[PDB]
Design a protein around this nucleic acid. Sequence first.
DNA 1: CTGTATCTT
DNA 2: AAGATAACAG
Lengths: 50, 220
Amino acid sequence: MASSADLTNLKELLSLYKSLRFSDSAAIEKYNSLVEWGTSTYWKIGVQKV
Amino acid sequence: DPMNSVTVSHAPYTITYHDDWEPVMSQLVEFYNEVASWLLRDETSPIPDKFFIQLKQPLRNKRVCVCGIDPYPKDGTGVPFESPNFTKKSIKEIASSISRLTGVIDYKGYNLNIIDGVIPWNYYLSCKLGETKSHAIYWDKISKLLLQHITKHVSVLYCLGKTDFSNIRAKLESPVTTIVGYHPAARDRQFEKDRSFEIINVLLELDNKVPINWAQGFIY
DNA sequence: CTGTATCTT
DNA sequence: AAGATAACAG
Ligand SMILES: O=c1cc[nH]c(=O)[nH]1
């Protein structure tokens, strides 16, 4: 039901983990917000906030 | 050679296991002795010789646990979801979903227990014949002991059923990546919309692990 | 008909 | 905890 939108979010999180440059503040915001979302939704995930 | 035994009062008398399970076998024996008489009053799915066969699996090569509630109300084999026939609702839905995901369209069956990376698990190890969840009261403390043990080893835990697993975190000390989806036998058509198998592979990449190859599950 | 979980009172 | 609910196979 909601697992498609969960997938979409996780994909984007993974896309950002890969693309992300520390110099880009908007990416870090988006990424950190996805890591929070991901962490609280699945309890624990393999990546950290930066 | 990796396969130790241990003994218990009531049927099935011996339990064989693999070294990976050694830490839990003491409390398991203690616990199984306190309840076995009671649960054995009922005919069960699976039969008692099969309650523990999943203990012969190693854990150290496992990164995903796929966890159901309890055995099929009828004709459980002791391997979660396994239907030697390919007649049970639940493995059929799971097989469809993998089909959509992978492109494999011709298959005879599907089995979650022949997949590198994966341990299929049932939270409760038996039910009275024909009655889902009938033995939850007996398995309870044992269920919690084994799941906690399993989750020390794997990266991802995928629980099949919103009703029985919405409170699953309370069940475990120690956080582990945990996804709770609709059960395949849900009575609307909710498992057809579940994306959880993809979702596991994405989660696995995020923990720097190899994706599960779900195609390995098909029986041709 | 019965056999195979979810959600809201 | 109790009741209403859905759909599909057999
Ligand atoms: O083994 C099984 C079979 C059906 N449903 C489950 O949750 N587990």
